Design a binder for this molecule. Structure first.
Ligand code: HEM
Length: 395
């Protein structure tokens, strides 16, 4: 075995990718790395290779629960359906599959559309400058997931504080991480109790009824599933949208192109998903459960692999001019939502929020531009998903 290389190669800076990813793809080899916590791993950088570790059955995500799992976070996160194999993965995802399907999410489009109008109504009447993150991005994805899930949006003052700790690499000490995480699990348990004697017409109410009258999940499985859905809808989506807004505001000829032809929006959303490196470094580790050869390496049973999804999304053997934003690309087999068995449950929900938000924003503010130099936009530091912390704009 090679002497392991330090990983992360460095701090993730704005939306730039480290040069080592490009070199690794060309070499066609995995890199033995030593990560901030847990086992050593293999880093996987090519598209065809990230596809394999994400969904090949010889690579297990449940096996990582029985290990000191190779990770960037000080504490192992319970990842609900993202951390299990079949048959447990089937049984749990069955319980949420229909509400997140494309036809299911389409029934929310009038409400998201109505919400985006309310939010931009307010920008129009307040006048520039506006922090686009505070006045648009966080309300939108916050209110959409809170209404769908049942979580009180008015409770964001208390639970938004604990949300950060599930994403923290270096931003929080391990003790503060354990305190917030347990505070978050108590708060979800609060809401679940509320549904036992007052049922609700929302996703959380459906999940308690599936536990209480079908016994399809344990009580902790219910709480983990509720937490992951709130993390991904409140934080991961607002990070991608703010990042996508940064790209369009600093590459404004592409903004103007999307604005002048708003029917590109479905292609522009997929391309903004491919091009934006949302994942700061890597997604969740897999452990091989038998010997697997790939990237010049026989990965042995018991060994960890780390999929570098943003690097796969720049792979020159799948995407023409991969490092150039092409909002018109027609076929776009990106891995920004994962691949295969654990492909992102909220995929359609994110698409519809992004198409609607980008269309109205560009439409209602044809002269929209940043109100500060792109280099002085501040960025989240030491977190698992990249995002601007403020997006000052004018029009
Ligand atoms: C732009 C926003 C988002 C992005 C870029 C994104 C990305 C991803 C990726 C890359 C994976 C696969 C991870 C892996 O295999 O290591 C994943 C899985 C998942 N995502 Fe998201 N996601 C987003 C928003 C959401 C939303 C809004 C929800 C739900 C409300 C959600 C729920 C889930 C779940 C439950 C899984 C695990 C699915 C399974 O295990 O079958 N995500 N996501």
């Amino acid at each position: 075995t090679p002497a392991p290389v330090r990983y992360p190669f460095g701090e993730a800076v704005r939306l730039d990718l480290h040069p080592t990813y490009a070199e690794l793809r060309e070499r066609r080899t995995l890199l033995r790395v030593r990560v901030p916590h847990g086992d050593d791993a293999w880093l996987v950088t090519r598209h065809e290779d990230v596809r394999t570790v994400l969904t090949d059955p010889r690579f297990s995500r449940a096996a990582a629960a029985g290990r000191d799992e190779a990770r960037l976070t000080p504490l192992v996160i319970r990842t609900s359906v993202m951390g299990v194999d079949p048959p447990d993965h089937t049984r749990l995802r069955r319980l949420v599959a229909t509400a997140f399907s494309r036809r299911g999410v389409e029934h929310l489009r009038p409400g998201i559309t109505a919400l985006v109008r309310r939010l931009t109504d307010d920008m129009v009447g307040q006048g520039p400058p506006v922090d686009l993150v505070r006045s648009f991005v966080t309300p939108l994805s916050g209110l959409v997931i809170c209404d769908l899930l049942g979580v009180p949006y008015a409770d964001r003052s208390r639970f938004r504080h604990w949300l950060e700790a599930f994403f923290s690499i270096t931003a929080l000490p391990a003790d503060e991480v354990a305190v917030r995480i347990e505070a978050m699990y108590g708060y979800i348990a609060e809401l679940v109790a509320l549904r036992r004697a007052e049922p609700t017409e929302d996703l959380l109410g459906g999940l308690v009824r599936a536990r209480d009258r079908d016994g399809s999940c344990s009580e902790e499985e219910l709480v983990d599933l509720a937490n992951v859905l709130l993390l991904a809808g409140y934080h991961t989506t607002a990070s991608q949208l703010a990042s996508s807004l940064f790209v369009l505001l600093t590459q404004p000829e592409h903004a103007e192109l999307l604005r002048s032809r708003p029917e590109l929006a479905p292609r522009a959303v997929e391309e903004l998903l491919r091009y934006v490196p949302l994942i700061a470094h890597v997604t969740f580790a897999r452990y091989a459960t038998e010997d697997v050869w790939l990237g010049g390496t026989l990965v042995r049973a018991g060994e960890a692999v780390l999929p570098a999804v943003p690097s796969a999304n720049r792979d020159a053997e799948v995407f023409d001019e991969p490092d150039r934003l092409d909002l018109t690309r027609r076929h776009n087999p990106h891995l920004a939502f994962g691949h295969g068995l654990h492909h992102c449950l909220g995929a359609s929900l994110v698409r519809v929020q992004m198409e609607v938000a980008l269309t109205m924003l560009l439409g209602r503010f044809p002269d929209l531009a940043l109100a500060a130099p792109p280099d002085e936009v501040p960025w989240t530091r030491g977190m698992q998903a990249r995002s601007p912390l403020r997006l000052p704009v004018t029009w």
